[PDB]
Amino acid sequence: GDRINTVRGPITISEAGFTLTHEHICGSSAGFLRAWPEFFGSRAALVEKAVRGLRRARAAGVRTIVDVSTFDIGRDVSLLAEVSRAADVHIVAATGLWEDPPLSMRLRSVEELTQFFLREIQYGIEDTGIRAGIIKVATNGKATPFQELVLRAAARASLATGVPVTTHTLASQRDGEQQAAIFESEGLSPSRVCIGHSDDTDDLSYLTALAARGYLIGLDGIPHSAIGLEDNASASALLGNRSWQTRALLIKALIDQGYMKQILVSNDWLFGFSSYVTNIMDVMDSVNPDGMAFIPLRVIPFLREKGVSNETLAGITVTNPARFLSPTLRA
Amino acid sequence: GDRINTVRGPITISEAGFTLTHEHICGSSAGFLRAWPEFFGSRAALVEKAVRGLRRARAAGVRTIVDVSTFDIGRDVSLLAEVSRAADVHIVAATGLWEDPPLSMRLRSVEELTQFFLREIQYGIEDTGIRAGIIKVATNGKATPFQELVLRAAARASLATGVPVTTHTLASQRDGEQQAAIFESEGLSPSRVCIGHSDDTDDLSYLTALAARGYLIGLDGIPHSAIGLEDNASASALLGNRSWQTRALLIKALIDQGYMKQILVSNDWLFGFSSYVTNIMDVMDSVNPDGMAFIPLRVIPFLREKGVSNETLAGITVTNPARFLSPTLRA
Ligand SMILES: CCC1(C)CCCCC1
Ligand SMILES: CCC1(C)CCCCC1
Ligand SMILES: [Zn+2]
Numbered sequence: 195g196d197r198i199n200t201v202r203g204p205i206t207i208s209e210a211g212f213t214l215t216h217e218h219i220c221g222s223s224a225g226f227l228r229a230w231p232e233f234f235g236s237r238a239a240l241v242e243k244a245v246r247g248l249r250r251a252r253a254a255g256v257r258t259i260v261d262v263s264t265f266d267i268g269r270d271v272s273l274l275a276e277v278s279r280a281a282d283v284h285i286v287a288a289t290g291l292w293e294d295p296p297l298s299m300r301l302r303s304v305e306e307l308t309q310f311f312l313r314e315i316q317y318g319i320e321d322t323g324i325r326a327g328i329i330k331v332a333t334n335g336k337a338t339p340f341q342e343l344v345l346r347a348a349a350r351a352s353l354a355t356g357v358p359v360t361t362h363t364l365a366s367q368r369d370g371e372q373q374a375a376i377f378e379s380e381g382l383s384p385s386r387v388c389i390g391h392s393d394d395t396d397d398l399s400y401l402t403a404l405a406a407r408g409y410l411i412g413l414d415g416i417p418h419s420a421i422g423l424e425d426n427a428s429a430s431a432l433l434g435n436r437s438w439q440t441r442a443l444l445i446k447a448l449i450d451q452g453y454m455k456q457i458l459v460s461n462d463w464l465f466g467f468s469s470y471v472t473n474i475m476d477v478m479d480s481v482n483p484d485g486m487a488f489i490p491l492r493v494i495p496f497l498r499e500k501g502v503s504n505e506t507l508a509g510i511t512v513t514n515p516a517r518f519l520s521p522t523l524r525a
Numbered sequence: 526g527d528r529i530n531t532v533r534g535p536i537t538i539s540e541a542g543f544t545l546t547h548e549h550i551c552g553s554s555a556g557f558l559r560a561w562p563e564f565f566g567s568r569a570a571l572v573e574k575a576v577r578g579l580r581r582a583r584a585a586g587v588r589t590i591v592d593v594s595t596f597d598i599g600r601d602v603s604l605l606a607e608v609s610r611a612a613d614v615h616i617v618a619a620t621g622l623w624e625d626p627p628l629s630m631r632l633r634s635v636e637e638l639t640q641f642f643l644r645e646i647q648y649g650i651e652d653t654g655i656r657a658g659i660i661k662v663a664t665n666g667k668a669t670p671f672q673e674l675v676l677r678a679a680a681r682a683s684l685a686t687g688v689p690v691t692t693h694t695l696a697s698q699r700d701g702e703q704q705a706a707i708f709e710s711e712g713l714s715p716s717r718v719c720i721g722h723s724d725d726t727d728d729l730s731y732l733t734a735l736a737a738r739g740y741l742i743g744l745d746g747i748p749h750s751a752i753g754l755e756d757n758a759s760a761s762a763l764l765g766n767r768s769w770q771t772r773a774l775l776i777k778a779l780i781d782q783g784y785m786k787q788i789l790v791s792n793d794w795l796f797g798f799s800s801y802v803t804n805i806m807d808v809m810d811s812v813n814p815d816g817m818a819f820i821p822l823r824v825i826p827f828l829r830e831k832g833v834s835n836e837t838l839a840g841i842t843v844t845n846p847a848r849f850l851s852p853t854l855r856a
């Protein structure tokens with residue numbers, strides 16, 4: 195807890211600056227970018243789009259993103275390093291497993307999984323020597339038996355290293371409650387855990403029950419909305435029909451309840467996206483042309499106009515991410 | 526149909542020699558070997574075990590294997606090339622999709638998939654320039670909607686290039702019938718298709734219905750048996766309780782019915798195996814210490830002793846694979 199691992203090495207806590215805690219360079223599948231780069235036009239075109247996007251984000255004040263792409267999201271840490279160097283934006287990489295693990299992962303024990311997460315945190319990802327600074331896990335409703343092993347192994351890895359855990363939920367099923375019970379049964383401190391996609395729900399009794407016990411709350415999909423996309427079912431099912439304003443007002447709600455130190459904010463944006471319908475990226479880019487700059491350009495001014503102070507917003511976008519990311523057992 | 530693509534380039538039909546048509550260097554998942562080589566001891570240990578295994582196979586008469594590992598079996602063509610060069614055994618690589626495609630594949634159209642298979646056949650796998658010489662597909666019972674797209678795209682790729690298709694079935698559900706109907710609805714010639722795992726069933730009415738219409742029959746798992754593995758459920762569910770002799774006698778049955786030109790024989794062996802329970806490889810290696818040499822060392826003498834001629838066996842192990850692998854629309 196003097197240093198956070200990024201794809202270009204250790205940085206100090208003050209270097210992190212304004213940090214987006216849930217993003218993706220590319221939302222894909224393991225091996226997919228190497229096997230089928232033309233899906234994205236080309237590898238070089240994906241690089242360029244990401245570099246330009248991160249440069250716009252940097253010009254709006256962003257200094258670091260946490261790329262929460264796992265193995266099964268097709269995380270390519272060389273791609274991340276390349277993009278990070280060209281855009282002059284720090285990128286923290288992730289270990290863990292999301293919702294699409296292949297058989298070679300799904301057949302593993304809790305102990306085996308813990309070894310895998312530990313490898314990626316303590317030694318390096320693949321042969322790159324790049325180390326993950328965060329562990330990403332997932333459920334979508336009631337955990338499957340394998341997802342329970344994942345959550346346990348994430349807890350064990352976090353307990354050995356101090357690196358935080360961040361989660362994918364189906365927020366309407368209140369999955370944070372089950373995630374929390376499993377993490378706690380392994381002895382993990384809630385202050386090392388972000389329950390993500392929590393802006394997908396308006397249930398304050400769920401959000402406050404998590405925050406009351408010490409969890410960080412990931413209000414991480416603020417520009418996800420299909421409002422005013424006429425007759426696009428696939429975009430609707432992915433993005434929802436709640437407005438970005440509704441999502442953003444959750445940030446204010448939690449501040450008003452005393453939880454300003456526990457809120458993490460992000461876009462959950464990407465520059466490529468192969469794990470859904472073809473051309474989702476173009477649909478998403480039309481909905482939110484600011485991409486990752488959407489938080490500083492649109493959300494911050496919206497909240498200031500609703501009465502949230504500049505100091506409070508800086509605490510949420512700079513202090514909370516540094517405190518979350520800094521390795522420790524108890525933050 | 527003067528040349529077959531291998532992981533070290535084109536070879537002529539007579540160079541193929543005695544060919545095992547359904548094998549694996551490593552049965553894994555995309556990205557898995559690169560991310561977690563220690564699962565296999567090490568990458569170098571996997572290489573060594575495979576080299577020694579293929580050397581024993583070569584000393585028993587094998588000259589070529591067809592590695593039917595796809596993308597989602599974690600096919601690593603550089604690993605295959607390395608092993609092939611050190612063992613002096615030709616390896617044909619595969620494209621297609623088996624039973625574990627990730628989301629980035631499962632969301633694709635028939636046209637998109639056809640482009641992907643065509644890439645791997647006509648251009649190269651990843652950035653290696655190595656081209657697949659066969660297309661591998663799979664069902665396990667009634668095809669899912671995505672598996673139907675896979676089978677169609679395999680047919681389309683085969684129709685453009687002449688490269689054959691080979692299949693995984695759940696033979697007890699007679700999946701070959703549905704596979705055949707889909708391939709035929711795309712216009713594919715049965716003489717370009719091997720219906721694999723066909724030695725998993727004793728149903729002659731199923732096997733002959735496929736052979737009668739021109740399909741090749743993959744009797745490809747001959748040493749798979751859990752007989753005399755006391756109380757090992759996982760090995761039993763994978764390997765079955767029919768003896769290798771029972772499987773091998775299917776070769777004789779089809780010869781006796783007039784189908785000697787349509788039989789392809791293999792072990793469906795591997796040197797690493799991460800997509801099942803931990804230590805399956807050790808269990809499998811104790812059941813069949815000859816590995817890929819099991820066909821020439823054990824099956825061939827068994828069939829000669831039951832009255833099959835040497836010439837017939839050479840036609841099955843040399844001529845049928847050359848005729849199957851040689852690119853053409855109608856073999
Ligand atoms: C103490 C919380 C506060 C009044 C500070 C400024 C941001 C909005 C709420
Ligand atoms: C014509 C088929 C045959 C009598 C030849 C030798 C192998 C066994 C059957
Ligand atoms: Zn998610």
Ligand SMILES: [Zn+2]
Nearest residue numbers: 378384407408
């Ligand atoms: Zn507690």
Ligand SMILES: [Zn+2]
Nearest residue numbers: 394432433434
């Ligand atoms: Zn939603």
Ligand SMILES: [Zn+2]
Nearest residue numbers: 217218262462
């Ligand atoms: Zn995400």
Ligand SMILES: [Zn+2]
Nearest residue numbers: 692693694722
């Ligand atoms: Zn199979």
Ligand SMILES: [Zn+2]
Nearest residue numbers: 709715738739
């Ligand atoms: Zn026909």
Ligand SMILES: [Zn+2]
Nearest residue numbers: 725763764765
């Ligand atoms: Zn069986």
Ligand SMILES: [Zn+2]
Nearest residue numbers: 548549593793
């Ligand atoms: Zn196989």
